[PDB]
mmCIF file of all heavy atoms in Angstrom:
data_model
loop_
_atom_site.group_PDB
_atom_site.id
_atom_site.type_symbol
_atom_site.label_atom_id
_atom_site.label_comp_id
_atom_site.label_asym_id
_atom_site.label_seq_id
_atom_site.Cartn_x
_atom_site.Cartn_y
_atom_site.Cartn_z
ATOM 1 N N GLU B 51 1.367 0.398 23.028
ATOM 2 C CA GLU B 51 2.320 0.202 24.158
ATOM 3 C C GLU B 51 3.522 1.154 24.037
ATOM 4 O O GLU B 51 4.120 1.468 25.084
ATOM 5 C CB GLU B 51 2.781 -1.255 24.196
ATOM 6 C CG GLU B 51 3.349 -1.667 25.538
ATOM 7 C CD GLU B 51 3.557 -3.165 25.683
ATOM 8 O OE1 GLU B 51 4.079 -3.788 24.728
ATOM 9 O OE2 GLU B 51 3.199 -3.709 26.753
ATOM 10 N N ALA B 72 -10.621 10.914 32.731
ATOM 11 C CA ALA B 72 -10.251 10.990 34.164
ATOM 12 C C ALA B 72 -8.736 10.872 34.325
ATOM 13 O O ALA B 72 -8.123 11.732 34.950
ATOM 14 C CB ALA B 72 -10.977 9.932 34.963
ATOM 15 N N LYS B 75 -4.429 14.653 31.907
ATOM 16 C CA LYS B 75 -4.457 16.133 32.006
ATOM 17 C C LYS B 75 -5.205 16.661 30.777
ATOM 18 O O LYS B 75 -4.895 16.198 29.663
ATOM 19 C CB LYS B 75 -3.038 16.707 32.113
ATOM 20 C CG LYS B 75 -2.852 17.745 33.219
ATOM 21 C CD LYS B 75 -1.608 18.607 33.085
ATOM 22 C CE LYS B 75 -1.554 19.709 34.122
ATOM 23 N NZ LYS B 75 -0.572 20.755 33.755
ATOM 24 N N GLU B 82 0.624 24.408 27.882
ATOM 25 C CA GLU B 82 0.370 23.937 29.276
ATOM 26 C C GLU B 82 0.860 22.491 29.470
ATOM 27 O O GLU B 82 0.883 22.033 30.630
ATOM 28 C CB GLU B 82 -1.120 24.027 29.624
ATOM 29 C CG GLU B 82 -1.681 25.441 29.570
ATOM 30 C CD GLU B 82 -3.173 25.537 29.846
ATOM 31 O OE1 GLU B 82 -3.638 24.887 30.816
ATOM 32 O OE2 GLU B 82 -3.870 26.243 29.085
ATOM 33 N N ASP B 87 6.366 15.341 22.045
ATOM 34 C CA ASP B 87 7.081 14.943 20.802
ATOM 35 C C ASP B 87 6.213 15.282 19.589
ATOM 36 O O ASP B 87 6.749 15.843 18.612
ATOM 37 C CB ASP B 87 7.423 13.454 20.798
ATOM 38 C CG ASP B 87 8.451 13.082 21.850
ATOM 39 O OD1 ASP B 87 9.513 13.739 21.872
ATOM 40 O OD2 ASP B 87 8.184 12.141 22.636
ATOM 41 N N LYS B 99 -4.171 23.925 9.405
ATOM 42 C CA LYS B 99 -2.986 24.765 9.064
ATOM 43 C C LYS B 99 -2.713 25.762 10.197
ATOM 44 O O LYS B 99 -1.534 25.915 10.575
ATOM 45 C CB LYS B 99 -3.186 25.510 7.742
ATOM 46 C CG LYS B 99 -1.986 26.335 7.293
ATOM 47 C CD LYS B 99 -1.901 26.528 5.792
ATOM 48 C CE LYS B 99 -2.935 27.488 5.241
ATOM 49 N NZ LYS B 99 -2.537 28.899 5.446
ATOM 50 N N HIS B 119 -9.150 17.474 -0.667
ATOM 51 C CA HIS B 119 -8.203 16.913 -1.678
ATOM 52 C C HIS B 119 -7.593 18.046 -2.513
ATOM 53 O O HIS B 119 -6.401 17.948 -2.858
ATOM 54 C CB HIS B 119 -8.870 15.849 -2.577
ATOM 55 C CG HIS B 119 -9.226 14.572 -1.880
ATOM 56 N ND1 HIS B 119 -8.284 13.605 -1.558
ATOM 57 C CD2 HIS B 119 -10.418 14.087 -1.455
ATOM 58 C CE1 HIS B 119 -8.879 12.596 -0.948
ATOM 59 N NE2 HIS B 119 -10.189 12.867 -0.872
ATOM 60 N N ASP B 124 -1.039 22.736 -1.704
ATOM 61 C CA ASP B 124 -0.800 24.089 -1.130
ATOM 62 C C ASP B 124 -0.548 23.974 0.379
ATOM 63 O O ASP B 124 0.369 24.652 0.873
ATOM 64 C CB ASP B 124 -1.960 25.041 -1.433
ATOM 65 C CG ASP B 124 -2.091 25.404 -2.904
ATOM 66 O OD1 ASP B 124 -1.105 25.234 -3.654
ATOM 67 O OD2 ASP B 124 -3.180 25.852 -3.294
ATOM 68 N N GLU B 135 12.663 24.882 9.157
ATOM 69 C CA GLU B 135 13.171 25.981 10.025
ATOM 70 C C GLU B 135 13.265 25.508 11.483
ATOM 71 O O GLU B 135 14.258 25.867 12.151
ATOM 72 C CB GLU B 135 12.268 27.216 9.928
ATOM 73 C CG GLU B 135 12.857 28.442 10.613
ATOM 74 C CD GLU B 135 11.913 29.616 10.799
ATOM 75 O OE1 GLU B 135 10.694 29.387 10.892
ATOM 76 O OE2 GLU B 135 12.404 30.758 10.861
ATOM 77 N N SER B 150 -4.402 6.408 4.250
ATOM 78 C CA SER B 150 -4.278 4.942 4.033
ATOM 79 C C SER B 150 -4.609 4.604 2.572
ATOM 80 O O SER B 150 -3.733 4.042 1.898
ATOM 81 C CB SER B 150 -5.126 4.179 5.029
ATOM 82 O OG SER B 150 -5.960 3.223 4.401
ATOM 83 N N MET B 158 -1.114 0.662 -6.431
ATOM 84 C CA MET B 158 -1.929 0.061 -7.524
ATOM 85 C C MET B 158 -1.572 0.729 -8.861
ATOM 86 O O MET B 158 -1.387 -0.007 -9.844
ATOM 87 C CB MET B 158 -3.427 0.214 -7.258
ATOM 88 C CG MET B 158 -3.937 -0.650 -6.126
ATOM 89 S SD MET B 158 -5.722 -0.457 -5.995
ATOM 90 C CE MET B 158 -6.128 -1.873 -4.983
ATOM 91 N N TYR B 168 -10.363 3.841 -9.813
ATOM 92 C CA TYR B 168 -11.662 4.328 -9.298
ATOM 93 C C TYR B 168 -11.645 4.211 -7.775
ATOM 94 O O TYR B 168 -11.187 3.181 -7.252
ATOM 95 C CB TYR B 168 -12.808 3.523 -9.908
ATOM 96 C CG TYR B 168 -12.837 3.454 -11.414
ATOM 97 C CD1 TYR B 168 -12.551 2.274 -12.081
ATOM 98 C CD2 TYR B 168 -13.194 4.554 -12.178
ATOM 99 C CE1 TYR B 168 -12.610 2.187 -13.466
ATOM 100 C CE2 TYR B 168 -13.241 4.491 -13.561
ATOM 101 C CZ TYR B 168 -12.962 3.299 -14.209
ATOM 102 O OH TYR B 168 -13.036 3.213 -15.571
ATOM 103 N N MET B 177 -19.677 13.449 6.265
ATOM 104 C CA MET B 177 -19.641 14.650 7.145
ATOM 105 C C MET B 177 -19.899 15.890 6.279
ATOM 106 O O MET B 177 -20.837 16.649 6.594
ATOM 107 C CB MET B 177 -18.294 14.790 7.865
ATOM 108 C CG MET B 177 -18.239 15.955 8.859
ATOM 109 S SD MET B 177 -16.705 16.960 8.764
ATOM 110 C CE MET B 177 -16.971 17.893 7.255
ATOM 111 N N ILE B 197 -23.297 6.272 -1.298
ATOM 112 C CA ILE B 197 -23.484 4.889 -1.821
ATOM 113 C C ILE B 197 -22.630 4.740 -3.081
ATOM 114 O O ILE B 197 -22.689 5.585 -3.978
ATOM 115 C CB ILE B 197 -24.971 4.614 -2.112
ATOM 116 C CG1 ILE B 197 -25.902 5.064 -0.977
ATOM 117 C CG2 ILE B 197 -25.165 3.150 -2.470
ATOM 118 C CD1 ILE B 197 -25.673 4.383 0.343
ATOM 119 N N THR B 222 -35.881 19.309 -1.006
ATOM 120 C CA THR B 222 -35.290 18.451 -2.068
ATOM 121 C C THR B 222 -34.678 19.345 -3.151
ATOM 122 O O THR B 222 -33.493 19.135 -3.487
ATOM 123 C CB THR B 222 -36.325 17.474 -2.640
ATOM 124 O OG1 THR B 222 -36.768 16.626 -1.579
ATOM 125 C CG2 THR B 222 -35.775 16.618 -3.759
ATOM 126 N N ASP B 234 -24.850 14.211 -8.930
ATOM 127 C CA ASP B 234 -24.988 12.836 -8.384
ATOM 128 C C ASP B 234 -26.473 12.494 -8.244
ATOM 129 O O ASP B 234 -27.254 13.374 -7.853
ATOM 130 C CB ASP B 234 -24.296 12.704 -7.025
ATOM 131 C CG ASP B 234 -22.832 13.109 -7.045
ATOM 132 O OD1 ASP B 234 -22.130 12.738 -8.006
ATOM 133 O OD2 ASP B 234 -22.409 13.797 -6.096
ATOM 134 N N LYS B 248 -28.333 7.068 12.091
ATOM 135 C CA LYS B 248 -26.851 7.240 12.113
ATOM 136 C C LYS B 248 -26.144 5.892 12.353
ATOM 137 O O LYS B 248 -26.638 5.082 13.171
ATOM 138 C CB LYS B 248 -26.414 8.196 13.224
ATOM 139 C CG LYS B 248 -26.340 9.677 12.872
ATOM 140 C CD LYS B 248 -25.992 10.510 14.105
ATOM 141 C CE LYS B 248 -25.366 11.860 13.824
ATOM 142 N NZ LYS B 248 -26.387 12.867 13.464
ATOM 143 N N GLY B 260 -5.558 -2.032 -15.805
ATOM 144 C CA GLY B 260 -4.546 -1.376 -16.649
ATOM 145 C C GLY B 260 -3.439 -2.304 -17.105
ATOM 146 O O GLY B 260 -3.596 -3.533 -17.001
ATOM 147 N N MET B 274 -12.583 -2.116 2.168
ATOM 148 C CA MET B 274 -12.678 -2.047 3.646
ATOM 149 C C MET B 274 -14.156 -1.991 4.030
ATOM 150 O O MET B 274 -14.937 -1.327 3.316
ATOM 151 C CB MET B 274 -11.975 -0.805 4.205
ATOM 152 C CG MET B 274 -10.497 -0.744 3.911
ATOM 153 S SD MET B 274 -9.681 0.516 4.915
ATOM 154 C CE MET B 274 -10.332 2.000 4.153
ATOM 155 N N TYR B 301 5.121 15.990 4.918
ATOM 156 C CA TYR B 301 4.904 14.737 4.150
ATOM 157 C C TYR B 301 3.411 14.397 4.067
ATOM 158 O O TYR B 301 2.702 14.529 5.077
ATOM 159 C CB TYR B 301 5.623 13.563 4.820
ATOM 160 C CG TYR B 301 7.103 13.746 5.028
ATOM 161 C CD1 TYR B 301 7.600 14.182 6.245
ATOM 162 C CD2 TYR B 301 8.009 13.442 4.025
ATOM 163 C CE1 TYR B 301 8.961 14.334 6.457
ATOM 164 C CE2 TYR B 301 9.373 13.598 4.216
ATOM 165 C CZ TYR B 301 9.850 14.039 5.439
ATOM 166 O OH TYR B 301 11.191 14.195 5.640
ATOM 167 N N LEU B 312 4.225 1.122 11.662
ATOM 168 C CA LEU B 312 4.140 0.015 12.657
ATOM 169 C C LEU B 312 5.195 0.195 13.757
ATOM 170 O O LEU B 312 6.254 0.772 13.473
ATOM 171 C CB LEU B 312 4.349 -1.316 11.934
ATOM 172 C CG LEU B 312 3.152 -1.818 11.133
ATOM 173 C CD1 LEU B 312 3.556 -2.955 10.204
ATOM 174 C CD2 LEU B 312 2.038 -2.265 12.064
#
Side-chain angles (χ1 to χ4, degrees):
Chain B
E51 200 169 44
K75 227 197 174 196
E82 299 177 45
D87 293 308
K99 183 153 73 80
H119 291 283
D124 292 341
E135 189 192 27
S150 129
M158 289 184 164
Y168 306 110
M177 184 225 74
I197 314 299
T222 299
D234 305 317
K248 271 176 157 80
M274 299 193 289
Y301 304 97
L312 283 167

